[model samples]
Target: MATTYEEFAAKLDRLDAEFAKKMEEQNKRFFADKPDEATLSPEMKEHYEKFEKMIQEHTDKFNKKMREHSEHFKAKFAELLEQQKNAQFPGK
Candidate 1:
């Protein structure tokens, strides 16, 4: 038996939401246990700052790509749903 459009869409949407939540937890961890910038040794502090900045940049890029790709997928899926709805019942 074939899956309905609504079922497929809901699955994808649930997976996306779960992924976003996991990413948010990871982002929170990134700063959760870190020492204060003013308390670190100069060299360590500089390194930490650089690492944090690099991670932030990568996270920003990843989020942008995810949003773009997700939007594209949703648009295509919508089109597919429309096509399916207009097709003869019980046929592909």
Candidate 2:
């Protein structure tokens, strides 16, 4: 189980790092010439709203997937513990 724990932790770290990198790159490209907040032209504002919606959906999907992944890991750990308990409890 320690091996499994290490793998899971590493995966989490890799995911977060990659996500941060991608977001930073995309934001820099998209907002490179962004004007002052009070001076957004119609299309610029429209695109900004679109970007907001896009990222919001991305966040929602990431949240849902993480919950699903958390459930899987918990179930896996529980199974491992249950097996160990059963192995030790049987005298035969």
Candidate 3:
């Protein structure tokens, strides 16, 4: 059976919270093993710089996708809620 608006809203809220937590953990892990600027080996420093740039690029892209998907999901939820309400309680 299709979920009611209230149930769908709660599920989405829980999903959003879990997603936020996961992203926070991933960000922490991504930067957990960095050498200090002064102590890096030449090769390590070069690799770190390149990796940092790559990470930044991917992170930006990922953030953009997240925003787009979040907005899409919100709109979908709203439309579904409206549809359900209209179908369930017609002609007041």
Best by lDDT: 3
Off by over 4 Å in 3: 1-4, 17-68, 86-92
Clashes of 3: 0
Residue 54, candidate 1: C-alpha displacement in angstroms: 29
Ranking by TM-score: 3, 1, 2
Candidate 1 local Cα displacement, residue 34, angstroms: 50
Q: Can you give the lDDT of residue 28 in candidate 2?
A: 66
Better of 1 and 2 by TM-score: 1
Q: All candidates' TM-scores?
A: 0.25, 0.22, 0.27
Candidate 1, 1-85: lDDT as tens digits: 1233434434444334222323345445457648666453333233233333433546444545566556555455555555446
Candidate 2's TM-score? 0.22
Question: How accurate locally is residue 9 in candidate 3, as Cα lDDT from 0 to 100?
Answer: 40
What's the residue-level lDDT of 33 in candidate 3? 50
Candidate 3 lDDT, tens digit per residue, 44-83? 2332333344334454345445655665565665565565
